[PDB]
Design a protein around this ligand. Structure first.
Ligand SMILES: [Ca+2]
Ligand SMILES: [Ca+2]
Ligand SMILES: [Ca+2]
Lengths: 160, 57
């Protein structure tokens, strides 16, 4: 969703207008005003490829932000921009160890919230408290107050 | 006489092709009804499948 929404916001206005037009084309005559498994499969047939039902479910689950089981415009942009794989080309294991070490400056084996916050402060961008909390949750899985190396590895999916 | 022959054949062509066109119209209506019914059934089946999959998980 991270790279997806980033690419979405990177779209231009004319592109988003074409996306809205294509959405109206896909939901043309629909009954829920959104693209569900039925409408997505209909579009896939209209194209040529055939999609597995479980695959259609898993895809709609990888684009929704609401919880409707259907694809709306806000999710149409994600479903129409996810093509480029932004989170590919994972950094080398040595580079990952370097990342963990420099995030664990005091040499302890854990990236406490203080290190993450000072890092966000150092980056220079205006860090919002909500951003801090969301990143802290994304890293620290068990919510013990620190990001270990396994939780840090988990922090690298959707990141590049 | 040739013109009369052509006129008679043409009248028959009108009757048969108009019957064809009406049959095509009825078949299009029937096909649209069947398509809509199949689409609604597929939507219902997909919703029930999603529910059953959640329950299964
Ligand atoms: Ca949705
Ligand atoms: Ca530390
Ligand atoms: Ca933790």
């Amino acid at each position: 969703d991270d790279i997806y929404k980033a690419a979405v916001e990177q779209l231009t206005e004319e592109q988003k207008n074409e996306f809205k037009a294509a959405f109206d084309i896909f939901v043309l005559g629909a009954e829920d005003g959104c693209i569900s498994t039925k409408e997505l499969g209909k579009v896939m047939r209209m194209l040529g490829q055939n999609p597995t039902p479980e695959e259609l479910q898993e895809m709609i689950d990888e684009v929704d932000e609401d919880g409707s089981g259907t694809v709306d415009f806000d999710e149409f942009l994600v479903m129409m921009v996810r093509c480029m794989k932004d989170d590919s080309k994972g950094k080398s294991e040595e580079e990952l160890s370097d990342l963990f070490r420099m995030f664990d400056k005091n040499a302890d084996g854990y990236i406490d919230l203080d290190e993450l916050k000072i890092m966000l402060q150092a980056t220079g961008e205006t860090i919002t408290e909500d951003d801090i909390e969301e990143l802290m949750k994304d890293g620290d899985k068990n919510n013990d107050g620190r990001i270990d190396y396994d939780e840090f590895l988990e922090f690298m999916k959707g990141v590049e | 006489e040739e013109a009369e022959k052509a006129a008679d054949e043409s009248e028959r062509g009108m009757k048969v092709i108009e019957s064809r066109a009406q049959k095509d119209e009825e078949k299009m209506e029937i096909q649209e009804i069947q398509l809509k019914e199949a689409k609604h059934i597929a939507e219902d089946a997909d919703r029930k499948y999603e529910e059953v999959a959640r329950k299964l998980v």
